Amino acid sequence: KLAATPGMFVQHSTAAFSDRYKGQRVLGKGSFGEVILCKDKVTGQEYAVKVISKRQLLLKEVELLKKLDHPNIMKLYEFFEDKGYFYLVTEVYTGGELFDEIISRKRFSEVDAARIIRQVLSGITYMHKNKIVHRDLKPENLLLENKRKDANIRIIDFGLSTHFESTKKMKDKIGTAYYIAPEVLHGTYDEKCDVWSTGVILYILLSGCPPFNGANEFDILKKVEKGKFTFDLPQWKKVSEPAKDLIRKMLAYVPTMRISARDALEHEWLKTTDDSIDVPSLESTILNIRQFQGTQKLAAAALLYMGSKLTTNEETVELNKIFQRMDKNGDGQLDKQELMEGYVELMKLKGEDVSALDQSAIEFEVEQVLDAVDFDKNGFIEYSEFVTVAMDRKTLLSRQRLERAFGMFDADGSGKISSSELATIFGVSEVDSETWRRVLAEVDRNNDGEVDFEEFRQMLLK
Ligand SMILES: Nc1ncnc2c1c(-c1cnc3[nH]ccc3c1)nn2C1CCCC1
Ligand SMILES: [Ca+2]
Ligand SMILES: [Ca+2]
Ligand SMILES: [Ca+2]
Ligand SMILES: [Ca+2]
């Protein structure tokens, strides 16, 4: 098919960054280049851009980020290349670094730490599934989305990340003293390095101190390479055994003996909670998902575009909680069984009896929801797919958002969407005549062979 994915929408622009964005301030420096809070000149929306000098050549971080769609992974909007520069426009997270909260609150609640680590493990479980290793996980590269109390966590800085193969092992030495796994120092490593790092992070969150420390960089790396850490400090008397157990498993010296991300999610400890949802909100969401009816590809791209690239964080904070709670196994994907239990979970909340339920009837209904909603036909409902679908359709199809989507689709400004433009949107040479025929047959009002902003408008407004 034509697989509708958020990533397909980030395309190499041939406009000047300067024509559409305006620098506001410096947020900081990354793995390689600095990040500049910018504003879209026309919509006043804020993004965090990463600028990279051509002199200091690979836009690798862009390709990785297009393949990832996860509620705890940094979002990428678009990117510009210059004579001298690259610009990677991304969503801006306004709660700042975990690092700073660490040095502020000093020590984390087991509840808060479990939540945080769960989301990080979820991000990497997803990444590892897609053959990507981060390689530089630390509180610096974890952002709180906003200032709210128990803010969601985003992974950032994929500038040192790479594709890995189960066949051939990685050799380049990459990371940060406190967080680097011994095998990266040794010169041969795999995706388990990401676990080790996350295990270090966890240790810090719970105790306030790193597990391997030293007077300087060099001292630390020796301590790290020896692998030995202890729970000998007084603040550990306040922490539960399972938490230590997980830590042990995540910092097991030998990679093959160390827990995978995917398995770490299932650990006892990470199910530590205290945090609930309004029934109405959940009901709205569940009802919006049930009522999404599949459609032609122009509409699919449009909705996914609006849902994945044109929605702010403020708008999706509730949707984001729901998804994580419906994702029982953490992997960043909703599956048929997860979906089934969601509806059941809601049914308990409504008093309706679990026993008196046609399990197979529901399971059937769920198969059909999945079919409607799974934009890329990978058998899973990903976050942006979920948002597009679960958001209130009048909220999503605000009169702004509609105008903005159409603009993006009508690349030559002709006031009409052509099949060539649609192909362009999908990142593919041409749209199957079958598909386009299917598309026009449902939309073309004047019947001029193309879709204008009224034809477009009503297409979605159903
Ligand atoms: N997206 C962001 N939103 C908010 N704050 C951000 C960032 C980034 C950041 C991290 N990785 C990025 N890759 C491409 C752009 C980009 C931006 N870095 N930072 C801050 C500046 C460095 C430390 C925290
Ligand atoms: Ca799942
Ligand atoms: Ca999907
Ligand atoms: Ca056109
Ligand atoms: Ca027309």
Q: How was this structure determined?
A: X-ray
Residues 204 and 109 in one domain: yes
For residues 47 and 136, state if they share a domain. no
Alpha-carbon span 351 to 75, nearest angstrom: 39
Measured distance CA(96)–CA(305) in Å, rounded: 27
Pairing relationship of beta strands 132-133 and 153-155 according to DSSP bridges: unpaired
3-state secondary structure of 121: helix
Q: Is the CB of 90 under 6 A from ligand 1?
A: yes
Of 144, 141, 143, 123, give the one whose Cα is nearest residue 132: 123
Q: Are 381 and 334 in contact (CB under 8 A)?
A: yes
Question: How far, CA to CA in Å, does 127 sit from each of 67, 162, 194, 258, 332?
Answer: 9, 10, 10, 18, 10
Choose the final residue of a domain: 212, 244, 274: 274
Q: Which residues contact 144 (CB under 8 A, 6 or more apart)?
A: 93, 95, 96, 97, 98, 101, 151, 152, 153, 154
Instruction: Mark which of 214, 241, 274 sits at the end of a domain.
Output: 274
Indicate whether 84 and 112 sit together in one domain. no
Contact yes or no for 231/248 (Cβ under 8 A): no
- Burial profile 393-404: b = 16 or more Cβ within 10 angstroms, e = fewer: beebbeeebbeb
Verify that 134 and 234 share a domain, yes or no.
yes
Distance (Å, rounded) from C-alpha 415 to C-alpha 35? 35
Q: Of 407, 414, 410, nearest to 422 (Cα)?
A: 410
Residues contacting 410, CB < 8 A, separation 6+: 416, 417, 421
Question: Are 249 and 266 in the same domain?
Answer: yes
Q: Kindly report each contact of residues 442-450 with a partner whose C-beta sits within 8 Å and lies 24 or more positions away, as own/partner.
A: 442/295, 442/296, 443/296, 443/298, 448/416, 450/416, 450/417, 450/418
Residue list, CB under 5 A from ion ligand 3: 374, 376, 378, 380, 382, 385
CA distance 171 to 82: 32
- Cα gap 406→4, rounded to integer Å: 16
Here the CATH number for the domain that contains residue 136 is 1.10.510.10
Report how far residue 263's alpha carbon sits from residue 241's, in angstroms, rounded to the nearest whole number.
Answer: 18
Structural domains of the chain, count:
3
User: For residue 50, how far is its CA from the centre of ligand 1 (angstroms)?
Assistant: 7
Residue 385 near residue 316, CB atoms below 8 Å? no
Domain shared by 11 and 58, yes or no: no
Structure tokens at 275: 């945090």
Is-contact 419 329, C-beta < 8 A?
A: no
d(CA 343, CA 345): 5
430 & 337 share domain: yes
Are the CB atoms for 176 and 116 separated by under 8 Å?
no
For helices 433-443 and 419-426, the axis angle rounded to 10 degrees is 120
**DSSP reduced 3-state for 369:** helix
User: Which CATH number fits the domain that encloses residue 70?
Assistant: 3.30.200.20
Pairing of β 132-133 and β 21-29: unpaired
**Rounded to an integer, what distance in angstroms lies between the CA atom of residue 68 and that of residue 62?**
10
Please give the annotated binding residues for Ca(2+), written as ranges: 327, 329, 331, 333, 338, 376, 378, 380, 382, 385, 410, 412, 414, 416, 421, 444, 446, 448, 450, 452, 455
Rounded CA separation 221/263 (Å)? 28
Sign, Cα dihedral of 116, 119, 125, 126 = negative
CA distance 60 to 136: 15
Whole-angstrom distance, CA of residue 260 vs CA of residue 121: 9
Q: How far apart are the CA of 302 and the centre of ligand 4, in A?
A: 15
Task: Kindly calculate the radius of gyration of the chain based on its CA atoms and give it in whole angstroms.
Answer: 23
Helix H or strand E encompassing 348: helix 336-349
Q: CA torsion sign, 432 to 433 to 438 to 443?
A: positive
| CA distance linking residue 391 with residue 326, whole number of Å | 15
- Is the same domain home to 83 and 9? no
b/e map 49-72, b = 16+ CB within 10 Å: bbbbeeeeeeeebbebbbebbbbb
Residues at the binding site for ADP are 31, 50, 91, 93, 97, 140
Type and span of the H or E element at 364 = helix 359-373
In this structure, what DSSP letter does residue 332 have? S
Return d(Cα 414, Cα 41) in angstroms, integer.
Answer: 22
CB of 374 sitting under 6 A from ligand 1: no
178 Cβ below 6 A of ligand 1: no
Contact assessment for residue 395 and residue 379, using Cβ atoms and an 8 Å cutoff: no
Residue 240 near residue 114 (C-beta atoms within 8 A): no
Instruction: Please tell me the distance from the alpha carbon of residue 182 to that of residue 171, in angstroms, as a whole number.
Output: 12
End-to-end CA distance of the chain: 24
- Closest atom of ligand 1 to CA, residue 74: 1
Listed residues 274, 292, 313: the one ending a domain: 274
187 and 38 within one domain: no
Are residue 231 and residue 258 in the same domain, yes or no?
yes
Which residues are marked as active site?
Answer: 136
C-alpha 136/C-alpha 65 separation (Å) is: 15
Q: What's the rounded Cα separation, in Å, for the pair 210 and 203?
A: 7
Instruction: Say yes or no: 145 and 5 in one domain.
Output: no
- β-sheet bridge partners, residue 76: 90
Residues 205 and 87: their CA atoms lie apart, in Å, by 33
Pairing of strands 142-144, 21-29: unpaired
What is the C-alpha separation between 50 and 210, in angstroms, rounded?
29
Joined tokens for residue 114:
């479990």
- Identify the CA nearest to 110 among candidates 206, 207, 201, 236: 206
Q: Could you tell me if 288 and 412 are in contact, meaning their C-beta atoms sit under 8 angstroms apart?
A: no
Give the H/E segment covering residue 282: helix 279-290
> H or E stretch including 89?
strand 85-91
SS3 80: strand
Helices (H), 97-240: 98-105, 110-129, 182-186, 192-207, 217-226
> Reported resolution in A?
2.8
**What ligand 1 atom has the least distance to the C-alpha of 92?**
3
Q: Identify the domain containing residue 296 by its residue range.
A: 1-15+275-462
Residues in binding site: 31, 50, 91, 93, 97, 140-141, 157, 327, 329, 331, 333, 338, 376, 378, 380, 382, 385, 410, 412, 414, 416, 421, 444, 446, 448, 450, 452, 455
Residues 89 and 125 in one domain: no
The number of angstroms, rounded, from the C-alpha of 315 to the middle of its chain's C-alpha atoms is 16
Characterize 257-287 residue by residue with b for buried, 16 or more Cβ atoms within 10 angstroms of its Cβ, and e for exposed. Answer: ebbbbbebbebebbebeeeebeeeebebbbe
Q: Which of 36, 90, 140, 312 to mutate to test the pocket of ligand 1 (most atoms within 8 A of CB)?
A: 90
Nearest CA to ligand 1 atom 16: 50
What whole-number distance in Å separates Cα of residue 426 and Cα of residue 435? 12
